[PDB]
RNA sequence: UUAGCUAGUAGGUGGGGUAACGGCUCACCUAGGCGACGAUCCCUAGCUGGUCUGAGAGGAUGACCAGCCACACUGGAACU
RNA sequence: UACCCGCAGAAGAAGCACCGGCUAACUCCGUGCCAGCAGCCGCGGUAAUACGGAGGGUGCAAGCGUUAAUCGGAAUUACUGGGCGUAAAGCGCACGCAGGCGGUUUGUUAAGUCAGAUGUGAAAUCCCCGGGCUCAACCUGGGAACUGCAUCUGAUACUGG
């Protein structure tokens, strides 16, 4: 790494890829759910996480985790995915924006309500 | 081979001081005479002495204080692979004023403090810290 | 743009008295100042590094009533000026207007000073100032206006202030309800519990 | 032609016109050969409101540069304030 | 008089025939508030016994740092066996810009205006021993005057 | 006085036109090592007095052809 | 993980043309020129003053504002 | 219209995220590898400070968050500023063109280098003093900077010829 070696062959920069490639640098892209199905995660956890397999707006086909405690999602219904890797489901990188545009919020949740789309209680 | 006589001189000073020599010796030259003159002026050697008619040996008598070395660190700046020519505002100030930096200016070889008081840059040969 | 909560929760949370109430009553008699506020308030952990810098910053913020982006702009201006950074930050927070009204004693506390300023009652150089965050300058008069000259709470606040100790970088003549910011204060004239290297380290993280 | 005119650099309800020796066929805020002075319309009391380098202005008027209406009135105002 | 700051309390483990044996160490620095520091490393079976032993080992074998008013005398690099580190003098009154263990050892050391940066690995042990090395190899201009055989205004 | 350069000669195989390798000495914009870069100029000349190895002083003129815009003012070191 | 490219192509002389030099355009001749200091080829891109970040060297980027370039349904051509 | 003046009443005006460590902020109740949280380490299998609810608090505040995107931290592309025995890394070894670097003395040249001046780096922005909009954002005067380029004039230590 002398300066003659540097001008003969330059110091190559450190480029790297985005971990959410299907969003196309859009913060929320709108997907149509083709499937909604449960999967048990990879060990040492054990549950039945709900992954909705959506076809995005730009032709991409990705599954995406569903948050909250329970849901209402079927197929044929447009939702918004927002990125963010769920650690324990192998090969799922997106969450669904709970509250957005067909997927209503959790039932009777009182705290953290903006993250799950629930109006103020009176 | 001997691709840097000035770094030969500086490495000999650093080695002799870190190995507790008293009178180190090297082959002489005009730039070595000028740099050793700067060091004897500022007080990083006791006295230098160039002996020899056709090809001489320059001898440097090293200083000590309480056993420890006097030159704490000494290094090149403008090595021959990559030379460092510096303008007057972009001059160094090694060790926040304490150490000296030898600059060859148009008016011979002189310490960077004298270079700032004469108002011209040059080439930085060493950072006697 | 303010904090409208129970003020002794702030005073009890820091532990030091923030000069948040008047002084007719002893504030240790007013609140249970010994324990911390909340339920688990008899617990005192070995307070961490983020904790100790946050506690010094929040003590200054809740003494002077200044919110966070206002404080961050005061820090940016303080580090931007010449001289010592903490000295300049305390100089700017002292050169706020409602702090000047509290030091001259026209309002009871700093919050009452904020209400007195904000309700159109202070004349800096004979000019109405409607804003609690006016910056005052050296050699500058500051006076109460004529529709506020009759208010009983001003002379009650005056008797409370001249019961308290006086600030030394000001001139006051309360028989006119006025005074003058004679010189910008120093670090030495202020209090010593307010520390400064913690604030400059927290906003230079 | 090249004119000496006024470009309105300011904010809402409170303009501030800087005079420019600019081309005719450019924009108002566009390029200019040389900037000479300014005129603050809502400039207050006890201060200076208008400042024009009459040396460079008369140099350009000799050089063939015309005048504008408002800066003509302003040059008359400066030489009257003399 | 001497103010002391703990830095870290680690939980080392030695594996024997029965099982693991959990011990606790302690890395506490102590100093006067000026150029006199001593770090200390203690290690015992329970925590306050370890930190008291660390405080004794720091309360002796201290250092002698000559100083300016509250700031260093030159930029220093200091390396010791995990880490090289770089700490720099600052203007008057600008906060101890460091962190982790450098912050604790410098605010105990009574420097008050520094600019530091920890390169390499940053274990608390390694970086406090390297910071102590940096404060060692820092020297006063009166010391450099006596050393070089000049006067302090001749160095300027 | 005239802004004129000096460089060597690569070749002269075509007529009334030489090509000149000006090796100007530049600082490198990041690493600071003074590397050399030789720029070639198609230089016009009359009667073809120059050949490979000549050291020519040249000035810029009106463009004599498509890629040739420099004519010479004096010629030193004619041979090897 | 593109090493060859270039036939008006590199230059000359003569004619023509242009507001103006010039293969800009022709006739004839010379056989050249470009290339590992990256030619040619592929993919992406308006550029700059700047903006964001950074202690700094730099990294990313070109919204508003200002300068320059290009285009006006797509592809051309000329007139005034 | 800016702004000033008069009216009557505390009336018309506070939310969002978080609380296991990193990270400021803890206890009870409902669950029981279920429901779920997750930015990483990991939580949940019958006393869950990590899931859901309450109480309390902490942080921001007319905003608060989640996502996307850049830089920093990343000295994790290192010129300033890394490394090569064993962690990833010395071509299997030599010859050698181009390229890079070149002992020592003198003389000249002055290309690189340095220094002064000239032209220039549009204005806006950035920054330093200042002025105004009651304050600030914002608007604006003067100044340096515009780390460059070119030209003239010098100096000769280093490097080059
Ligand atoms: Mg606000
Ligand atoms: Mg300061
Ligand atoms: Mg590391
Ligand atoms: Mg022709
Ligand atoms: Mg003709
Ligand atoms: Mg950085
Ligand atoms: Mg067109
Ligand atoms: Mg068309
Ligand atoms: Mg929360
Ligand atoms: Mg905590
Ligand atoms: Mg949560
Ligand atoms: Mg169990
Ligand atoms: Mg339970
Ligand atoms: Mg959590
Ligand atoms: Mg980096
Ligand atoms: Mg990153
Ligand atoms: Mg490494
Ligand atoms: Mg191995
Ligand atoms: Mg290996
Ligand atoms: Mg080998
Ligand atoms: Mg060999
Ligand atoms: Mg040589
Ligand atoms: Mg020269
Ligand atoms: Mg400009
Ligand atoms: Mg003002
Ligand atoms: Mg020479």
UniProtKB/Swiss-Prot annotation, chain B:
Q: Which InterPro entries match?
A: Ribosomal_uS8, Ribosomal_uS8_CS, Ribosomal_uS8_sf
Concerning SUPFAM superfamilies, the annotation shows: Ribosomal protein S8 (SSF56047)
User: Tell me, which GO biological process terms does this entry list?
Assistant: cytoplasmic translation; regulation of mRNA stability; regulation of translation; ribosomal small subunit assembly
Q: Kindly give the Pfam families that the UniProt entry links to this protein.
A: Ribosomal_S8 (PF00410)
Answer yes or no on keyword Protein biosynthesis: no
GO molecular function, one example? Answer: structural constituent of ribosome
* Role: One of the primary rRNA binding proteins, it binds directly to 16S rRNA central domain where it helps coordinate assembly of the platform of the 30S subunit.
Name of the protein this chain belongs to:
Small ribosomal subunit protein uS8
Q: Which organism is the protein's source?
A: Escherichia coli (strain K12)
Query: Lineage in the entry?
Result: Bacteria, Pseudomonadati, Pseudomonadota, Gammaproteobacteria, Enterobacterales
Curated annotation (Swiss-Prot), chain C:
Which CDD domains is this protein grouped with?
A: S4
* Keywords recorded for this protein, A-Z: Antibiotic resistance, Repressor, Ribonucleoprotein, Ribosomal protein, Ribosome biogenesis, RNA-binding, rRNA-binding, Transcription, Transcription antitermination, Transcription regulation, Transcription termination, Translation regulation
Please list the GO biological process terms of this entry: cytoplasmic translation; DNA-templated transcription termination; maintenance of translational fidelity; negative regulation of translational initiation; response to antibiotic; ribosomal small subunit assembly; ribosomal small subunit biogenesis; transcription antitermination
Ranges for domain S4 RNA-binding come to 95-155
Organism in which the protein naturally occurs = Escherichia coli (strain K12)
User: Does the record's keyword annotation contain Secreted?
Assistant: no
Q: What name does the UniProt record give this protein? A: Small ribosomal subunit protein uS4
Identify one Pfam family in the record: Ribosomal_S4
GO MF entries: mRNA 5'-UTR binding; mRNA regulatory element binding translation repressor activity; rRNA binding; structural constituent of ribosome
Please spell out the taxonomic lineage of the organism that makes this protein. Answer: Bacteria, Pseudomonadati, Pseudomonadota, Gammaproteobacteria, Enterobacterales
PROSITE patterns listed in its UniProt record: RIBOSOMAL_S4, S4
Q: Which InterPro entries match?
A: Ribosomal_uS4, Ribosomal_uS4_bac-type, Ribosomal_uS4_CS, Ribosomal_uS4_N, S4_RNA-bd, S4_RNA-bd_sf
From Swiss-Prot, chain D:
Q: Which UniProt keywords apply?
A: Endonuclease, Hydrolase, Nuclease, Ribonucleoprotein, Ribosomal protein
Q: Name one GO biological process term.
A: cytoplasmic translation
| GO CC aspect terms | cytoplasm; cytosolic small ribosomal subunit; small ribosomal subunit
Q: Which GO terms describe its molecular function?
A: DNA endonuclease activity; four-way junction DNA binding; structural constituent of ribosome
Q: What induces it?
A: Part of the rpsP-rimM-trmD-rplS operon.
Domain of life (superkingdom): Bacteria
What the entry lists under InterPro entries is as follows: Ribosomal_bS16 (IPR000307), Ribosomal_bS16_CS (IPR020592), Ribosomal_bS16_dom_sf (IPR023803)
**Membrane-traversing stretches:** none
Family designation? Belongs to the bacterial ribosomal protein bS16 family.
Listed under subunit, the entry gives: Part of the 30S ribosomal subunit.
Described by its record, this protein's role is as follows: In addition to being a ribosomal protein, S16 also has a cation-dependent endonuclease activity.
Name of this protein: Small ribosomal subunit protein bS16
Q: Which gene encodes it?
A: rpsP
From Swiss-Prot, chain E:
Q: Impact of altering residue 103 to S?
A: In strain: NEA-319; neamycin resistant
Q: What Pfam families is this protein classified in?
A: Ribosomal_S5 (PF00333), Ribosomal_S5_C (PF03719)
Q: Which GO terms describe its cellular component?
A: cytoplasm; cytosol; cytosolic small ribosomal subunit
Q: Which domain of life is it from?
A: Bacteria
Q: Does the keyword rRNA-binding apply?
A: yes
This protein's record includes keyword Transferase = no
Q: Could you say what the effect of mutating residue 11 to L is?
A: In strain: SPCR9; spectinomycin resistant. Not a ram mutation
Its keywords, alphabetically, are:
Acetylation, Antibiotic resistance, Ribonucleoprotein, Ribosomal protein, RNA-binding, rRNA-binding
Q: Which Gene3D superfamilies match?
A: 3.30.160.20, 3.30.230.10
Every copy of the S5 DRBM domain together lies at: 2-65
Which InterPro entries does this chain map to?
Ribosomal_Su5_D2-typ_SF, Ribosomal_uS5, Ribosomal_uS5_bac-type, Ribosomal_uS5_C, Ribosomal_uS5_N, Ribosomal_uS5_N_CS, Ribsml_uS5_D2-typ_fold_subgr
Biological process, per Gene Ontology: cytoplasmic translation; maintenance of translational fidelity; response to antibiotic; ribosomal small subunit assembly; translation
What are the protein's GO molecular function terms? rRNA binding; structural constituent of ribosome
Instruction: List, alphabetically, the NCBIfam families matched.
Output: rpsE_bact
Which family is annotated? Belongs to the universal ribosomal protein uS5 family.
Q: What is known of its domains?
A: The N-terminal domain interacts with the head of the 30S subunit; the C-terminal domain interacts with the body and contacts protein uS4. The interaction surface between uS4 and uS5 is involved in control of translational fidelity.
Q: What else is known?
A: Altered uS5 proteins have been identified in a number of mutants. Some mutations in uS5 have been shown to increase translational error frequencies.
- Know the name of this protein? Small ribosomal subunit protein uS5
């Amino acid at each position: 790494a002398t300066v003659n070696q540097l001008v003969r062959k330059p110091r190559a920069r450190k480029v790297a890829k985005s971990n959410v490639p299907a969003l196309e640098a859009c913060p929320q892209k709108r997907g149509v759910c083709t499937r909604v199905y449960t999967t048990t995660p990879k060990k040492p956890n054990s549950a039945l996480r709900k992954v909705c397999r959506v076809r995005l707006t730009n032709g991409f086909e990705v599954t995406s985790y569903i948050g909250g405690e329970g849901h209402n999602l079927q197929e044929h219904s447009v939702i918004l995915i927002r990125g963010g890797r769920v650690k324990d489901l192998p090969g799922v990188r997106y969450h669904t924006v709970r509250g957005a545009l067909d997927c209503s919020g959790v039932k009777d949740r009182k705290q953290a309500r903006s993250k799950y789309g629930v109006k103020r209680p009176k | 081979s001997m691709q840097d006589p000035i770094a030969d001189m500086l490495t000999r000073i650093r080695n002799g001081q870190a190995a507790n020599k008293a009178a180190v010796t090297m082959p002489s030259s005009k730039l070595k005479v000028a740099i050793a003159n700067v060091l004897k002026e500022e007080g990083f050697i006791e006295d230098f002495k160039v002996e020899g008619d056709t090809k001489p040996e320059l001898e440097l008598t090293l200083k000590y204080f309480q056993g420890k070395a006097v030159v704490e660190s000494i290094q090149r700046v403008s090595r021959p692979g990559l030379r460092i020519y510096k303008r007057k505002d972009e001059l160094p100030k090694v060790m926040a004023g304490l150490g000296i930096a030898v600059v060859s200016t148009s008016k011979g070889v002189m310490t960077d403090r004298a270079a700032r008081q004469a108002g011209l840059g040059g080439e930085i040969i060493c950072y006697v810290a | 743009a303010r904090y409208l909560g129970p003020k002794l929760k702030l005073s009890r949370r820091e532990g030091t008295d923030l000069f948040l109430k008047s002084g007719v009553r002893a504030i240790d008699t007013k609140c249970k100042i010994e324990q911390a506020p909340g339920q688990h308030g008899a617990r005192k952990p070995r307070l961490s590094d983020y904790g100790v810098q946050l506690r010094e910053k929040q003590k200054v913020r809740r003494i002077y009533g200044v919110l966070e982006r206002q404080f961050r702009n005061y820090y940016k201006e303080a580090a931007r000026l010449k001289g010592n950074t903490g000295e300049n930050l305390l100089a700017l927070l002292e050169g706020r207007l409602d702090n000047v009204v509290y030091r001259m004693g026209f309002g009871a506390t700093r919050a009452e000073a904020r209400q007195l300023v904000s309700h159109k009652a202070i004349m800096v150089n004979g000019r109405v100032v409607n804003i609690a965050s006016y910056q005052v300058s050296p050699n500058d008069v500051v006076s109460i206006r004529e529709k506020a000259k009759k208010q009983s709470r001003v002379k009650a606040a005056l008797e409370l202030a001249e019961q308290r100790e006086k600030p030394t970088w000001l001139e006051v003549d309360a028989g006119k309800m006025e005074g003058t910011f004679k010189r910008k204060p120093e670090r030495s004239d202020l209090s010593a519990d307010i520390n400064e290297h913690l604030i400059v380290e927290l906003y230079s993280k | 032609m090249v004119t000496i005119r006024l470009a309105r650099h300011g904010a809402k309800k409170r303009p501030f016109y800087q005079v420019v020796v600019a081309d005719s066929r450019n924009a108002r805020n566009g390029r200019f050969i040389e900037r000479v002075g300014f005129f603050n319309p809502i400039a207050s009391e006890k201060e200076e409101g208008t400042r024009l380098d009459l040396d460079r202005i008369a140099h350009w008027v000799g050089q063939g540069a015309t005048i504008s209406d408002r800066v003509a009135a302003l040059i008359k105002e400066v030489n009257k304030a003399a | 008089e001497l103010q002391e700051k703990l830095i870290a309390v680690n939980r080392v483990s030695k594996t024997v025939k029965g099982g693991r044996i959990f011990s606790f160490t302690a890395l506490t620095v102590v100093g006067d508030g000026n150029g006199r520091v001593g770090f200390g490393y203690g290690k015992a079976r329970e925590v306050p016994a370890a930190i008291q032993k660390a405080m004794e080992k720091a309360r002796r074998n201290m250092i002698n740092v000559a100083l300016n008013n509250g700031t260093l005398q030159h930029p220093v690099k200091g390396v010791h066996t995990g880490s090289r580190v770089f700490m720099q003098p600052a203007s008057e009154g600008t906060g101890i810009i460091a962190g982790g263990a450098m912050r604790a050892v410098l605010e105990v050391a009574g420097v008050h205006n520094v600019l530091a940066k920890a390169y390499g690995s940053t274990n608390p042990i390694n970086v406090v021993r390297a910071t102590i090395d940096g404060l060692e190899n820092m020297n006063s201009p009166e010391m450099v005057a006596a050393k070089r055989g000049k006067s302090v205004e001749e160095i300027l | 006085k005239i802004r004129t350069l000096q460089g060597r000669v690569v070749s002269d195989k075509m007529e009334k036109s030489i090509v000149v390798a000006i090796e100007r000495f530049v600082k490198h914009p990041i690493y600071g090592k003074f590397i050399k870069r030789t720029t070639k100029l198609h230089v016009h000349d009359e009667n073809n007095e120059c050949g490979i190895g000549d050291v020519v002083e040249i000035r810029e003129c009106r463009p004599l052809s498509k890629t040739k815009s420099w004519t010479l003012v004096r010629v030193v070191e004619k041979a090897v």
